[PDB]
Amino acid sequence: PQITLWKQPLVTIKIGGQLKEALLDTGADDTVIEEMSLPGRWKPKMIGGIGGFIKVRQYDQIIIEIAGHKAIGTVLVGPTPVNIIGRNLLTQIGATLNF
Amino acid sequence: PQITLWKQPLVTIKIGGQLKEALLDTGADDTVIEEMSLPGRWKPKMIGGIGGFIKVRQYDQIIIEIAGHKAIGTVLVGPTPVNIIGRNLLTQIGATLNF
Numbered sequence: 001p002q003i004t005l006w007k008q009p010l011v012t013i014k015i016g017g018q019l020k021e022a023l024l025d026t027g028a029d030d031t032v033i034e035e036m037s038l039p040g041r042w043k044p045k046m047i048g049g050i051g052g053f054i055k056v057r058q059y060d061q062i063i064i065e066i067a068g069h070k071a072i073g074t075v076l077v078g079p080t081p082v083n084i085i086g087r088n089l090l091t092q093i094g095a096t097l098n099f
Numbered sequence: 100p101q102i103t104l105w106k107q108p109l110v111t112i113k114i115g116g117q118l119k120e121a122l123l124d125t126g127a128d129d130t131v132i133e134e135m136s137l138p139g140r141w142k143p144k145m146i147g148g149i150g151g152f153i154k155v156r157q158y159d160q161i162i163i164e165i166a167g168h169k170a171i172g173t174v175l176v177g178p179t180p181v182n183i184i185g186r187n188l189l190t191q192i193g194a195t196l197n198f
């Protein structure tokens with residue numbers, strides 16, 4: 001699709017058997033989801049933005065379906081105020097910014 | 100142009116006659132720029148990101164060029180980790196997300 005930016009570009013995602021709403025975020029290197037369980041090993045990470053850093057769990061090789069399009073990559077899980085789909089998965093669904 | 104997301108979507112902006120680098124950020128409602136001097140009066144705003152909140156100065160109707168495209172609108176100035184062009188100005192330059 002073509003998504004305009006008059007309002008937040010929120011989409012439905014499927015991750016870990018769950019549906020969630022998430023923001024398509026070109027300013028995010030990484031994908032960050034609110035607390036949930038994921039399979040496999042993880043390792044700790046600090047990620048930071050406006051207001052500082054938060055501690056997250058890094059899970060690799062997670063399959064996500066984003067607005068209908070499947071992708072695999074790393075997902076960070078922790079106390080983010082907004083589920084954000086970052087560039088590591090935006091690339092995989094072929095998303096671009098056009099103007 | 101068409102901007103892919105394999106690398107950060109950094110562009111050159113011009114504000115106050117000066118060139119700066121900034122991130123095109125569809126996950127940002129507002130444009131936030133590192134400390135600089137802007138003309139006129141400002142109003143207070145608190146903005147909230149991943150790691151909590153920062154206080155910024157809101158300047159309205161500021162002339163800014165983004166990747167060669169002219170915009171005039173609200174710029175927030177404060178202790179942001181990077182210069183962010185948010186949706187208030189992405190919509191002025193006609194940006195969309197496409198996949």
Ligand SMILES: COc1ccc(S(=O)(=O)N(CC(C)C)C[C@@H](O)[C@H](Cc2ccccc2)NC(=O)O[C@H]2CO[C@H]3O[C@@H]4OCC[C@@H]4[C@H]32)cc1
Nearest residue numbers: 027028029030048049050082126127128129147148149180
């Ligand atoms: C109302 O107006 C606003 C309100 C909030 C924000 S924001 O900067 O907090 N943010 C909102 C979003 C979290 C809901 C915009 C994001 O695009 C920021 C934009 C951002 C970029 C860099 C640093 C600070 C902020 N990105 C971000 O937090 O990315 C995280 C995840 O991946 C990592 O990549 C980034 O680069 C490495 C660190 C960050 C990490 C901007 C304008």
